Subunit: 293 residues, 4 copies
């Protein structure tokens, strides 16, 4: 079962921008400790697009060693290249992941038929692991229609869709057309509204520091406690407001650093460092979250 | 009281010659009232106001007032590209006894934010006391405002509400967070339930004309913490919206209302075309379903 | 000329302090344009602030311009409104006043289907009673993004004799010319006039022609004679001016310059358009001086 | 002449074999083919070279081979851009080692980088280019990065920047850029508006279609220089008839197919996810190849 609240894992680096293995292991354990349902590895949040294939594989392997069998593991193996995506998919299979995922190939304009074959090829290489189609027009530049999304999610081997779109009319339409589809809400800031529209779970970057709040919104809605659902979403958004200002990945890494999880809060260039003017708020947030749970 | 609630964006019934069909207009107003609607938003996109003359828009306002003033809330959309024309309609809305005025951000020409602000100020002045409902509808106006700009507009002297026709529910929540007492109408019918959850405390929509009770049902369900009921009602509304988008929204609605014996002739004004005959069977069945459901 | 090809100024509508039409200034502006050697005038479009004018006000302007320039220069009446019926009324008036052609921007705000757009133009053409139609493509303001195939269909509708192309896509400009060798094709963005002509346009309609139309005529001539350098220098000068007008606000900036040239009495635009920022007056006054001396 | 970057330069394609591996023989043939048709230089490792579906070592291999074939004969610009600054720096250092005349980098994409981050990205690559001029690459349609004129002005005035490849159809901006930077080497990026782009201010161009008909673009440069507008328009029109076709067939694969028919490329395949050319287009592509060979 792939339904649930899963954190989009960050990739800790050292001062020289190389993978910080110890911090990666610590972050995985930190997520498991807070009760996350699983981890989405190698996606935007893992800074996969500023990493080489071997580096992405290294992360996948380490995460599997740390969490396989404890929580669900989804490997984002997407690359612009189909061959590269297939290589990562085969590795994900070898490491024991529960599923693979791929963002619609970007930069170059590809036809819908080319997108479909891309997924089929990756699904083939995943050798049994279900595919999680990844729709994120804001970053990919690929704007799929409802009909195209319907076609992609019905491809043999596809078991879920990570929907990083704020269009909740489309979210409802997808649920209506696919009653049993695992549908992850992608934008943390509309989690509550996304679940109401039809999503049955979610994958997000901020889950790394406050995943319990999202689990709290799932519970609240399940119990009909709209008031609690809204309060939690509001608090999540006050945090997201900040992270968008500071830079999301580096902001999250900085909070995790103050929580003593990540040794060095750096992102790889061209991502710049956090503006020191935000440190007071990030430190205060880390303190608040540590007390909260 | 206040301006919070579920308000139908009123359609303007026309006769075979595209002239205002007063009799049908009156029937539609009473039809909405009987559905339990909290009020009416008159003279906006749905009333085909932008293909009407000022005199025609005033006529519709006056008649609606005659029919519903004192029974339900009445919001007059007096927006035009021209500030002066908007002001004329604002003055008339006051004269007819409306509860508030509203204006879409002036379109076509690219206006600076300062110009938009002065535009609203001028209309509020002519509204002579009636509160202003700012109207944000980027998809149709082409005006894309930032959160900061929206915050500035809703805090202008005389503004009492915002009709938010935007699918960005992060921004909906941000608006609610920054303005806890603001009357916030969800504009897109298809995300009503989620819009309320995000922070909207009511809504204004075109489809309320034929199934307003469903939207009232969503408000009640969420109020009682009945998530499943809210979702089921929204799903049903969306099945209808799916159809209306295919047939053309205004003409599809008028056609359903015709089959409900509310409107005599279901046509819209040119350039709007007639409904494709292949959709009539579905629209008739819908009309029957809604009537039996209600 | 027995055709509609040429350089036509998009006429501004002079208003008095009360925002009411300044007839005297309108007449002076029409005569000023004729004296500049303009080939014609495009009346009642964006530049005439038609969309913040009532139907009768737009008609009044059409009547006055006709009185002033009918038979002297070509006259194109932009009768476009969102409403088809309203557009038809202006088309009938344009015909009665003796205009050479009518024009209509793709109806905006509401999302109309392409078939609805086609019927819209057909209806207006009918009311134009013989006057050729100039389809007006201006996606930036209208929000209507037509495909090449849709544009081809529109320009070939019975009664259509030209296209005002306010688009910076010069690949599409060339494709239109390639598909329609004899089509009258007006370049809409003044800032790329020279390149637009090179791509296939055989004329142009623009707001800045009101204060320096001879420069655009000079560009046409320069290209006709193979004088690339002159065409570029002229376009560069026009763009230095356009840079300023975009900062000051185009219509009010143009009107202010015209006021300094003693053409327009009150350089005001109708609300929501605001007044020019006084900090720009020195540059606008200097520009007016430069243009007058340049003549 | 020794260091002048102005001119008409082809965006080089990367020939692959049936297994999607680099076809060295065809790559060398393509470089020679371009030199033979009088091209001023080559832009290597950009969008057209399918660099974004190639590894760093594969991109370096192409750079090295092209240098062996053309260094000293024509100008060589190495597009070393990657989303990653570090990878871009590696390619920049290799470009210098191989003897390229300049480096170039597309604005990093996918992630929404701030303008300051873009600036530091270019500065870092410029440092690694150690002397080779940088060609800023603005291509919003593919990168999704929409820069303002002020931002472009800031980028092209960074120390070490000697040119800008402007893949934008906004010819007002093209003129503004030329007006603000009279000495800036400015390459028109969209082949379909080459003539108008030069008229607006560009002093040269870089394009994918130059691989099969570069002499036409050189013809347009000459035509405009001589004040022969009719000839310039005629050539642009013929180029656009071809571009109309390539957009329908798929640009890179359509070009490779024509080059295959011209006996330059052994296998006209692009790397997945790019699909093969639809056979219904072969008649026009073969006829085009024949026409171009007749013309050349």
């Amino acid at each position: 079962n792939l339904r649930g609240v899963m954190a989009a894992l960050l990739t800790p680096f050292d001062q020289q921008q190389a993978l910080d293995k110890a911090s990666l292991r610590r972050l995985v354990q930190f997520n498991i400790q807070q009760g996350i349902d699983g981890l989405y590895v190698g996606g935007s949040t893992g800074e996969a697009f500023v990493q080489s294939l071997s580096e992405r594989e290294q992360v996948l392997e380490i995460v599997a060693e740390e969490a396989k069998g404890k929580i669900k593991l989804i490997a984002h193996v997407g690359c612009v290249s189909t061959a590269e995506s297939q290589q990562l998919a085969a590795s994900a299979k070898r490491y024991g992941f529960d599923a693979v995922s791929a963002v619609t190939p970007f930069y170059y304009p590809f036809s819908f038929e080319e997108h479909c074959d891309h997924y089929r090829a990756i699904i083939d290489s995943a050798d049994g692991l279900p595919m999680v189609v990844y729709n994120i027009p804001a970053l990919s530049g690929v704007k799929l229609t409802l009909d195209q999304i319907n076609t992609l999610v019905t491809l043999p081997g596809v078991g879920a869709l990570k929907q990083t779109s704020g269009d909740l009319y489309q979210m409802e339409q997808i649920r209506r057309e696919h009653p049993d589809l695992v549908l992850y809400n992608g934008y943390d800031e509309i989690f509550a509204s996304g679940l109401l529209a039809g999503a049955d779970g979610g994958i997000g970057s901020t889950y790394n520091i406050m995943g319990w709040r999202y689990q709290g919104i799932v519970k609240a809605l399940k119990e009909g406690d709209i008031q609690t659902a809204q309060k939690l979403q509001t608090e999540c958004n006050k945090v997201i407001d900040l992270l968008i200002k500071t830079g999301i990945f580096r902001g999250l890494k900085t909070v995790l650093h103050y929580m003593d999880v990540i040794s060095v809060p750096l992102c790889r260039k061209p991502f710049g460092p956090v503006d020191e003017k935000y440190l007071p708020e990030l430190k205060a947030l880390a303190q608040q979250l540590m007390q909260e749970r």
